[PDB]
Amino acid sequence: GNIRVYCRIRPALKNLENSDTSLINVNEFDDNSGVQSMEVTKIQNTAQVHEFKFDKIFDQQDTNVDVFKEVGQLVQSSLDGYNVCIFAYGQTGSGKTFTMLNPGDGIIPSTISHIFNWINKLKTKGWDYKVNCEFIEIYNENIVDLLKHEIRHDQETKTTTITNVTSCKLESEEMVEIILKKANKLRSTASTASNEHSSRSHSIFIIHLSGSNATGAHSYGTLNLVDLAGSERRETQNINKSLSCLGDVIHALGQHIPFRNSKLTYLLQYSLTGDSKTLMFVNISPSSSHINETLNSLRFASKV
Ligand SMILES: Nc1ncnc2c1ncn2[C@@H]1O[C@H](COP(=O)(O)OP(=O)(O)O)[C@@H](O)[C@H]1O
Numbered sequence: 001g002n003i004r005v006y007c008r009i010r011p012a013l014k015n016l017e018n019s020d021t022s023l024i025n026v027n028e029f030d031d032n033s034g035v036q037s038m039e040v041t042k043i044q045n046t047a048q049v050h051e052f053k054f055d056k057i058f059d060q061q062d063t064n065v066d067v068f069k070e071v072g073q074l075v076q077s078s079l080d081g082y083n084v085c086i087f088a089y090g091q092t093g094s095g096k097t098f099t100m101l102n103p104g105d106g107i108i109p110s111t112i113s114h115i116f117n118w119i120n121k122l123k124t125k126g127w128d129y130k131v132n133c134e135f136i137e138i139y140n141e142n143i144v145d146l147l148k149h150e151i152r153h154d155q156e157t158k159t160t161t162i163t164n165v166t167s168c169k170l171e172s173e174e175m176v177e178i179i180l181k182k183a184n185k186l187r188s189t190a191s192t193a194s195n196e197h198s199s200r201s202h203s204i205f206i207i208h209l210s211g212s213n214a215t216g217a218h219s220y221g222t223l224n225l226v227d228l229a230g231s232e233r234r235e236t237q238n239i240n241k242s243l244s245c246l247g248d249v250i251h252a253l254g255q256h257i258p259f260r261n262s263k264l265t266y267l268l269q270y271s272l273t274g275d276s277k278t279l280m281f282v283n284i285s286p287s288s289s290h291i292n293e294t295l296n297s298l299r300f301a302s303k304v
């Protein structure tokens with residue numbers, strides 16, 4: 001049940017931002033300590049350097065393809081029956097959706113592509129895998145099918161489902177295409193896109209991988225790819241408590257975990273416990289105008 005935290009600094013939006021009054025310096029991974037550190041300083045007091053450590057830090061030069069080089073190995077563990085959770089955390093504008101859904105290389109598209117390649121490869125070993133998914137949103141602690149919804153936890157299989165939620169088989173790149181196209185259009189920022197709403201809700205792309213080796217072996221693993229509501233400072237209190245609860249749970253898992261204190265953590269409890277693997281992605285802007293929210297985000301990531 002390993003937990004890791006990565007930080008990703010997105011490229012500056014030239015013509016809109018600059019780093020005139022702040023500095024974010026990323027150090028090279030430290031193989032003697034096993035982590036990578038970064039320093040953040042505000043011009044108003046350059047003697048105060050805030051240091052942060054992460055399992056890996058991606059800078060403005062790291063593309064989505066670069067990011068996946070470090071995520072591919074995590075997601076493939078689902079074919080072995082491990083559950084996986086990947087959370088994109090950060091203020092609105094930091095790059096959560098781009099990271100998770102950018103057409104072709106986002107974490108979700110890359111994951112599906114990667115899993116498919118592994119499935120085809122595993123066929124030569126007598127393995128037969130079936131893939132199905134759901135795309136939901138949690139807004140104001142209520143579940144919404146983005147494609148009555150009650151959470152059903154099966155203590156027997158240690159699996160979870162949601163009643164009346166659309167689930168689609170993923171047996172073709174064509175089905176993946178239309179679904180990922182709809183997902184992006186729904187969450188990405190487009191004129192006729194509900195970004196306002198999207199920024200205030202959590203979206204979860206769920207992928208179930210069921211395999212059978214007619215060796216007689218069987219395998220079931222679930223991947224939960226979450227694009228969290230913006231972390232920037234009753235709907236607002238819902239977001240605050242939900243993110244805070246998630247932080248409490250992830251941190252507790254890394255040490256009574258408060259899974260039931262939020263809809264999100266309650267939904268994913270089986271994918272957060274046992275030998276499940278969790279990756280927390282903290283997205284931040286490199287710009288001086290966002291420096292305070294950036295420091296907030298980095299502080300949340302630390303305790304996590
Ligand atoms: N890694 C990145 N590389 C290039 N552009 C990015 C990257 N991350 C975000 N962006 C751009 O920054 C803006 C913030 O995008 P978005 O992903 O929607 O943020 P958030 O989901 O956190 O609110 C978008 O216009 C997006 O295209």
Ligand SMILES: [Mg+2]
Binds near residue numbers: 096097098187198
């Ligand atoms: Mg977004």
